[PDB]
Amino acid sequence: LYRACLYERVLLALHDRAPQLKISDDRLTVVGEKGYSMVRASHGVRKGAWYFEITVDEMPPDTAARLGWSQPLGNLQAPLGYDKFSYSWRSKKGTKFHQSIGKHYSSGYGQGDVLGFYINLPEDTETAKSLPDTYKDKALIKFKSYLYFEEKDFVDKAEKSLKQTPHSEIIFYKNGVNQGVAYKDIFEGVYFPAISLYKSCTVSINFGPCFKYPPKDLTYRPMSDMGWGAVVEHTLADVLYHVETEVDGRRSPPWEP
Amino acid sequence: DGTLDCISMALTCTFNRWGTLLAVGCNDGRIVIWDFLTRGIAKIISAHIHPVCSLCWSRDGHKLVSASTDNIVSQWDVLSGDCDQRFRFPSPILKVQYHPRDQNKVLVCPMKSAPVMLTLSDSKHVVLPVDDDSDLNVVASFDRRGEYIYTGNAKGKILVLKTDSQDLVASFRVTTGTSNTTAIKSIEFARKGSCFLINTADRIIRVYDGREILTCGRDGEPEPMQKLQDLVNRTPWKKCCFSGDGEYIVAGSARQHALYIWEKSIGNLVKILHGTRGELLLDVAWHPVRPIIASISSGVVSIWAQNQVENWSAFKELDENVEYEERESEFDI
């Protein structure tokens, strides 16, 4: 087996879209027909600082996309911010949306905005302060005409206590120009970049090597870099699980990395 | 679709001007004026010992002209039931018809003689002309306003005279298609507008617009507004009539006791109503301001109404599922 991903680059994963969510790989744009929906990228951040963009190609008045981040447990039919595990921006006026609450602690949005998205989560130390073990589930299925793998995802968290990940933040840019900080309070758990569609919204996510107004930081990582990082990590996850079940013993170096 | 047990020997009926009362003749020769709203008989008039085969209301509705089978025509006040006037002729009367804009005048179509227009004020009579002088069977009718007289013979010839001068203002013979004539069974007009219909022996109803006949002149080739028939059964039509508005036309198949309903503009068959297979259809009429239709068959009257979607279907009633149109702020606070 293996978790081989049907993607030439780190893109919006088709496995985590709603059945009412359409894609066009000419620009990998995403569109819908009725109400709101949510799609996510292939990768997912667990530590460090990183950055991506969204390019908007169509925004009629009855068309309002929302763009941001969301942890798993995020119902991909909801408009990216209806729960406490998602933090986005509404693309009518720059308005930060989280817990379905709109906040005007933000700049203004434009119809042809190439918006940059910077986000820094602490290392898994300050994220967990404990073991970040990744014992994975793997189940083989043969759907109608093709083979696929099932894994167990996380459960709806009843977390009502605020324990922000230390020194984590989110910054929003309009064409590189700092639109400002969006959310400093960031809950634990991995996050991934996500896009919510209203009726017929056309937007697309984009990585770093083809950027327009990139930050010159030496620490932040584009979408593709964290993408292949997570891909290699899950490769090693398959390696270690097949090791566990197949050969007696396991062993890992001095824990820190 | 609803009958009345309180009247017997129904032979001929006629709506009042507003479709509130119905005067039906009986075999005993009695007038039964029955009301729609109270759904009961309003009056009983001892008209004749002879059954009544022709009945017409006055414009004010206070007069009814009745024709017995004894060739006895008589005018009756609807409030009192008295025989206002009474006349008798040879060649027993086939039909009477008040003049729509002058109730003093009334046209009469007899069996073998030409139709004659009489007045009630003066017991005079004007014999209307006959084209072929040998028809012996000519139906005649006023138009919607009583300005012209349409006379159709057993030989398909159609004369349009002016009601005052009896002068030939238009003429044409209807065809059986190839080259032949057909017995003009009846001429009907619309109480609204100018469209009229002809029932003929070919079992084909021909709908025209009288203005087109007037502009067609004498001895012309006016085409019908519509041609209507039972292409399936080729059934004769004992009696036909327009709708009150004049956009629906009904025919009574006495052959199989059914009712065909077509439109005027398109002419497509609206529907069919089936009566008792054992009943012999005799008389047909439409409510002048209602989708209600009175039928007389085997001495029994039946009523055919037409209701809307409501009377139980009135939340906001819809027919087909509706996809909810989600908004931009549909999930916003």
Side-chain angles (χ1 to χ4, degrees), chain B residues 34-103:
Chain B
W34 187 87
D35 178 274
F36 301 157
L37 277 299
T38 191
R39 315 219 286 102
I41 296 170
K43 194 71 172 182
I44 289 185
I45 301 181
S46 89
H48 320 271
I49 182 56
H50 280 248
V52 184
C53 84
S54 280
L55 271 165
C56 319
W57 291 78
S58 57
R59 177 187 185 93
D60 66 338
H62 301 260
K63 294 305 175 179
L64 274 158
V65 54
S66 89
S68 76
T69 45
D70 204 4
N71 210 335
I72 297 171
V73 291
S74 300
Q75 171 176 229
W76 313 76
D77 164 72
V78 307
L79 274 300
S80 62
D82 57 347
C83 178
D84 305 308
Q85 298 188 358
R86 178 157 60 256
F87 308 88
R88 194 175 293 99
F89 306 89
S91 84
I93 302 319
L94 290 175
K95 192 216 295 187
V96 295
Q97 177 194 28
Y98 276 126
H99 182 284
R101 288 197 165 192
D102 184 10
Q103 302 313 126

Side-chain angles (χ1 to χ4, degrees), chain B residues 222-234:
Chain B
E223 84 174 281
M225 287 187 58
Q226 199 60 260
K227 305 166 55 191
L228 279 190
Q229 58 169 333
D230 183 357
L231 76 162
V232 195
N233 184 267
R234 299 299 302 112

Side-chain angles (χ1 to χ4, degrees), chain A residues 34-36 64 66 79 90 97 100 198-199, chain B residues 323-333:
Chain A
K34 269 89 67 176
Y36 273 94
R66 279 166 57 157
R90 171 184 59 180
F97 272 79
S100 172
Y198 187 41
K199 298 175 305 191
Chain B
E323 297 183 349
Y324 177 71
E325 189 184 278
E326 293 180 51
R327 296 179 298 100
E328 203 284 324
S329 301
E330 191 65 33
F331 295 81
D332 296 355
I333 61 167

Side-chain angles (χ1 to χ4, degrees), chain A residues 121-133:
Chain A
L121 317 175
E123 296 276 351
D124 299 332
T125 67
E126 304 294 322
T127 304
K129 324 161 303 303
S130 43
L131 196 69
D133 191 300

